Amino acid sequence: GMAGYNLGTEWISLRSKLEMSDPVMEAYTQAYEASNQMVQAFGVIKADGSVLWQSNNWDLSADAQQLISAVNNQSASVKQNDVKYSTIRTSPESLVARNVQGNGTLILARIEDDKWVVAWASADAAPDSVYVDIDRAAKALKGKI
Numbered sequence: 727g728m729a730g731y732n733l734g735t736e737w738i739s740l741r742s743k744l745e746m747s748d749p750v751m752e753a754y755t756q757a758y759e760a761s762n763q764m765v766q767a768f769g770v771i772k773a774d775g776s777v778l779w780q781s782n783n784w785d786l787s788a789d790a791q792q793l794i795s796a797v798n799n800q801s802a803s804v805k806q807n808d809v810k811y812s813t814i815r816t817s818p819e820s821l822v823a824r825n826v827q828g829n830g831t832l833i834l835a836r837i838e839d840d841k842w843v844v845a846w847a848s849a850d851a852a853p854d855s856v857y858v859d860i861d862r863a864a865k866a867l868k869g870k871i
Contacts, residue, residue: 743868750871756866769781769846832845835864
């Protein structure tokens, strides 16, 4: 062996992607930066039934318990802040929610086992346009939720 130690001390170069104390509330800008045309909310959901987010756009804490139930049992049907969004595709990886008309675009993302990040793109926002941004604020901060 006789290997050589590398960075890691107050560098965050080897993001373990779990149990890593990362700066929360940063994902907002991480995606908003490129989504300047279509701002999307970012609300974290913990399998524990609690939510740790600060978007003030959609009541995710109101029913954090149910917010996860929509996927916990592939329900696909939840209303947050007078906004009903169902997913016509319950997969073991994620669930794509879409409104019949187009009011409330929520995208589910399983960053980890009991950890998954979800964002809400405006009606004007596209699926492939937000689905790409959410990834930056999903499987990038996984660990501090």
